[PDB]
Amino acid sequence: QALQKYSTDLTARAREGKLDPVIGRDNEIRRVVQVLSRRTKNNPVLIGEPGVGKTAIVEGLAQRIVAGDVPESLRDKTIVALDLGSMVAGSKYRGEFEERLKAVLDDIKNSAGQIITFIDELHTIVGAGADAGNMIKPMLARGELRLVGATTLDEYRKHIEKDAALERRFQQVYVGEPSVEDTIGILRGLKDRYEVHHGVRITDSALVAAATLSDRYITARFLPDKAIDLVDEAASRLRMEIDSRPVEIDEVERLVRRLEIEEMALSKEEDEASAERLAKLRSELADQKEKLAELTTRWQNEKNAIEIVRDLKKEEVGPDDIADVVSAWTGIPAGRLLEGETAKLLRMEDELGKRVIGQKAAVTAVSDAVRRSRAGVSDPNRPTGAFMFLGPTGVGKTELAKALADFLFDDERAMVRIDMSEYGEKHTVARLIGAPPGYVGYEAGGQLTEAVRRRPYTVVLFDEIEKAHPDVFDVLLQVLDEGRLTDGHGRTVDFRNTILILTSNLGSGGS
Amino acid sequence: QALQKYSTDLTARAREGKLDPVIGRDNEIRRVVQVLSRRTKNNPVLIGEPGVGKTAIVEGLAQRIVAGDVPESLRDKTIVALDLGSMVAGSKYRGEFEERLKAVLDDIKNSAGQIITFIDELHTIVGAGAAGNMIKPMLARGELRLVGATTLDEYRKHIEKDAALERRFQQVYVGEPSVEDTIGILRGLKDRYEVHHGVRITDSALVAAATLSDRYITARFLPDKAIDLVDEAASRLRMEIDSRPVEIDEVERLVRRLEIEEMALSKEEDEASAERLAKLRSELADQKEKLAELTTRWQNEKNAKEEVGPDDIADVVSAWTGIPAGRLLEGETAKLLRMEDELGKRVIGQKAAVTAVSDAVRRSRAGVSDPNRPTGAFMFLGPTGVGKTELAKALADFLFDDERAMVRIDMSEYGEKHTVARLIGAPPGYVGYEAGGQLTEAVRRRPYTVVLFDEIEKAHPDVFDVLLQVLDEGRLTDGHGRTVDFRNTILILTSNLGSGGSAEQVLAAVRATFKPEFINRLDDVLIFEGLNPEELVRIVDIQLAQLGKRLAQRRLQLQVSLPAKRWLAQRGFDPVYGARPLRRLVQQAIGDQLAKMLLAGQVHDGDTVPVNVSPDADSL
Amino acid sequence: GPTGVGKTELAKALADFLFDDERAMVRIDMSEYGEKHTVARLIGAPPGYVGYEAGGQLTEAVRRRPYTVVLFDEIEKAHPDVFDVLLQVLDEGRLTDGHGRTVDFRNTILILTSNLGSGGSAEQVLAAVRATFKPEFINRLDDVLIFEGLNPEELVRIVDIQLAQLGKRLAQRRLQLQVSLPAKRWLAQRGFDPVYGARPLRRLVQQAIGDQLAKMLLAGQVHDGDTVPVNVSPDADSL
Ligand SMILES: Nc1ncnc2c1ncn2[C@@H]1O[C@H](COP(=O)(O)OP(=O)(O)OP(O)(O)=S)[C@@H](O)[C@H]1O
Ligand SMILES: Nc1ncnc2c1ncn2[C@@H]1O[C@H](COP(=O)(O)OP(=O)(O)OP(O)(O)=S)[C@@H](O)[C@H]1O
Ligand SMILES: Nc1ncnc2c1ncn2[C@@H]1O[C@H](COP(=O)(O)OP(=O)(O)OP(O)(O)=S)[C@@H](O)[C@H]1O
Ligand SMILES: Nc1ncnc2c1ncn2[C@@H]1O[C@H](COP(=O)(O)OP(=O)(O)OP(O)(O)=S)[C@@H](O)[C@H]1O
Ligand SMILES: Nc1ncnc2c1ncn2[C@@H]1O[C@H](COP(=O)(O)OP(=O)(O)OP(O)(O)=S)[C@@H](O)[C@H]1O
């Protein structure tokens, strides 16, 4: 009766359909089943990096038990999910939590073995005493409590392996991350639940696109769920739009209201210099009211036509809604050039010519490399542009790197700029990679690394590349042509969406 | 009346035969007896690594007492097993625990010399107060026999800090058994598992599960890391002797799910998903074929296994630790023979290097390779843009069927001496100490990957001295005392020394930049030979296929003509820059042209575009 | 001395018969102690910083079982501070660690190893030895032995040893080889560059016998149990 107080039930939740379906991953289920049924020391532990699916496997095993697909030695067994915080909640006195846990263990052992224990994140059991989480050792080794567990691949090493007399009683089951083709199947089988939670519909191409697109942009997470987030956010945004009026009318209305409020207060300014700013505010206000009227008129035409066709006879998420989600995330633009960017990209060499005069070849070569990437033609695993341009002084080779970095971002200080005139000695490389573990500045990372990692779309400039020691080129050797360097902490950063630019002054006069 | 309240009875538990055989370990039991039969300070302590067997020795002593093989002054002693976890339980008051302990000690002392207290994991006796200290006077008089057993580390971490205590204790070191002793032990315990599971166990399996777990699984000790293989092979054979076997219970589960997916992908009101259903059904039929064939052959075999064999243990050790340890299941022996021409699908030329790589896999798999040495570690070098990294990525692309499964470090960043702590970790007592190594901690888990050292020459010549034992011994220790196992990976070392000689210049640069004791541990030092204008067409078509697959996301296959496919290889061939000028020329010719075409309308998706060679350029 | 001549396999052969297992020695690889602060791992951290409970790496393996032979691979590549620590092991007998205890190396067999110079008979190599170490640390050791190169006569016995090793390894699948004396002397005739020691013999074995055997074995026709002879051709060894 203490199991009721200090444990919830898992099969009693899987029987009422309150668990999500589990798809694939048969080898791991079979290994867990065949480890959970041996004579002694019969308790596995699902180990692996976070996100790959480790509680989903236990819930799939519970659903399989409820269905009856398990072997004879597991028919009609209840899975119990222990909770340790609720056992340490009130234990002030010197002998409360110990007898609590002992009563729980006695209630488990009293049964004929008709109970399968399940502690998730079992790395939290090494303490909990003050000494506890250690009296379980006699029963673990004898095999009287079948203890399925699951911990991260580096909480094990940090908490359990430090008690090598305990991690002997556990059998490890390595759960690797799935591939894109298996993520597609998982999504296919898992979509009709979000389809119900949000009153929308989800196209299958929108499931292929999520899995194939969240594998090359979001490189900091793993991939049974790195796409489910895209699908969920797309569905939620589409539901919001299915509610009151959609986007890009909801922005212009808010903007016009604010401009009106500002103009109604800037009018009563007894000044001479502020009367000039009130002459542009009204202009932009009228310009915005124009666009808002045009949008609200086109909206009625679309809806009107739809209703007409319905009486005569943008309502489901799509592969571009997924793209808009993954573009609001990470800031990287991967869309379809929605009629506002195509014109700008076509008149590109004419807007760089407003700040750089001449250098037609360089301007054309940069504009021709931005479009090969926006049009979806460039190599998907390489920087979108990496070229070194050089010449005599006062020519424009630093201006162009600052003229290109402007109209792409509407700003000027939005590019990561390091000037290699200070890297004269070869030991200064650590200034862009960090210090290896065990030195003074280590909990700071690199300076280029931790600047590209935060926004992986800015352009990077290497001024005066010739002035550096001839051993930093070797460091750059793999940034180019692959877009990847590491740091002290071991985390890889991807330079696969940035435009690298290296200026220099060699020759200086040669034809 | 408190002993039975707060303890149990090992002798009673063994009289009913609730224990296992303890065959072996004569000297340890003899020493335990002769120390227990002392006059004063008669209390031993079994000590050793976790898993070698330290409670089994006490269980054997109990069985031996019950049998009557002990000397005179041990007859009818009734060993008792104390449980301090119950003494401090609900003792929420001011003196309850102290008085419980005192009553138990008095009850033990009142018996003349019968009770032999046995506290397991006695390191937990230091605290428990708020006590556990009212035992030293009872101990330094010979009145308490206190048999105990703690691991080799928790002893010095908890008890050596109490030098008053450890003086009243005898230490009995229990070393681990060897492979022959492990086999002898296994031959006695097989009956218990043969009874628990309705299965028979073979002696060949018993000896394989001891000679194999000593080689592959090296993180635990070896009276018991061999028992698990038997205990899991038995469970798997029981599950198989149950309703359905395996490798049919996979095809069935896969076909069911494929049907469920096809039944719901058919009514998809789309045009882009039309070719995505045109292969699901193909794969489903190709799977039903194999399902039917296996289900038919099953009836043949059932009209025309029953006990665990020697390869079932191999299958268990292969499911564990990742490593393939089985014996050439069919479909593999054809893959390994096709290897040499299957790698040529991505790497053209360099057939010497291809053969030298495949010959280290076909050997280590057949089982003729050296066990205590990596399965191949060779450094190949040559000019630039030739394929040396492409080969290292294409090798690990069909051993694991996943490009990212390779362990890739690039030695361009290990330019200075102190960057060694970056792939090994920091010593005990510094800032980054929990994260461990970077190369170490990536092999200790899943020890079957391929390791790539890119531009080995760019590193400070003190990092080679760390790889000096990775080669020829396959082991390095991180900043934790954890010797990892490199004996079954494939090491690859790329470089660019010389780049301007046939063989003598590069072999002089190698001997001038490396040490002889380093060049000696290596396998064949392969030298690539540069590309020839003839076989560049086989690279042109691979690049074109790659580009096609890349832009196939919108159904834009190109009909590249033969004169264009020839022009793309006529120029763009440099005898100095390899094949990267070709990659650049492809996007200078087709890339920017199609990019201008595409976003200015007139090339809307679903269309096919032909290329044709103009007088100088080529038009779309 | 030179490379591949038997320096390491002697420290592994002494323990092999003093303990009946080549894994009963404390083999630490001194090629990783190339930094000054790396002394903390083979001695232990001070009381209570990050790793006090772990204790030393060298001192602990001998405080618990003080009869082990201790090997130091590539002592030349260490830092000139671990020598100042290992010094007090000699002419004293004991070693104190960061914990604050004292451990006695009075029953161990210290063994060092290096590859200094490798260019002179004894004069250049012993000058190099006297140049990097300290003379007060050298007059405490026993004989500073120099190992000799291999000769074609001392190589046929090594071929016999390697063939015995290969045969013992092929006992799992129950195979055994028949090596004709022409092949047994050809394998020693080739692979005698007197600059790389005995290593090239291992590679020649795997290239000649092992590769052919492993290509035949999984192509059927050499199924387990039976024996196989090896004979000589103009150049190669046909099986
Ligand atoms: N095989 C699978 N079939 C269906 N859904 C799956 C599968 N694997 C994972 N998922 C889903 O993907 C998500 C993964 O979440 P969890 O598995 O709960 O995270 P986790 O594996 O427990 O990792 P941590 O360490 O606990 S955060 C959940 O939404 C699961 O429902
Ligand atoms: N073609 C050009 N069009 C417009 N401004 C230019 C042009 N060339 C140079 N300038 C001006 O020159 C100034 C600095 O030129 P930079 O391009 O920064 O010099 P640079 O090209 O980097 O040469 P070095 O070798 O680095 S000093 C700015 O004020 C630019 O506006
Ligand atoms: N001499 C032996 N004969 C037969 N079985 C043995 C022998 N020694 C150990 N075993 C078995 O091997 C396993 C070892 O378990 P234990 O000895 O209880 O572990 P341990 O030595 O107590 O180590 P810890 O620190 O308590 S986890 C058990 O299944 C024993 O039954
Ligand atoms: N033999 C080849 N077969 C197929 N593709 C090749 C071949 N040689 C080169 N390539 C291609 O040309 C490029 C060469 O890249 P890598 O082989 O990685 O360069 P590399 O051989 O490592 O030379 P370095 O010294 O690293 S610059 C890649 O895009 C390869 O796909
Ligand atoms: N005298 C010898 N007798 C038998 N085998 C030998 C002898 N010398 C070398 N070998 C073989 O050569 C291989 C390596 O020899 P080692 O003695 O380990 O090299 P070493 O003395 O450490 O030299 P280095 O420069 O450190 S690699 C071993 O596998 C031995 O079988």
UniProtKB/Swiss-Prot annotation, chain B:
Region annotation NBD2: where it falls in the sequence: 332-530
> What is one process in the GO biological process aspect for this record?
cellular response to heat
Q: Where is this region: Linker?
A: 177-322
Q: Does the keyword Glycoprotein apply?
A: no
Q: What would you give as a GO molecular function for this chain, any one?
A: ATP hydrolysis activity
Where would you find this protein in the cell? Cytoplasm
UniProt domain comment? The Clp repeat (R) domain probably functions as a substrate-discriminating domain, recruiting aggregated proteins to the ClpB hexamer and/or stabilizing bound proteins. The NBD2 domain is responsible for oligomerization, whereas the NBD1 domain stabilizes the hexamer probably in an ATP-dependent manner. The movement of the coiled-coil domain is essential for ClpB ability to rescue proteins from an aggregated state, probably by pulling apart large aggregated proteins, which are bound between the coiled-coils motifs of adjacent ClpB subunits in the functional hexamer.
User: What is the protein name for this chain?
Assistant: Chaperone protein ClpB
- Which species expresses this protein natively? Mycobacterium tuberculosis (strain CDC 1551 / Oshkosh)
Full-protein residues shown:
159 to 845 of 848
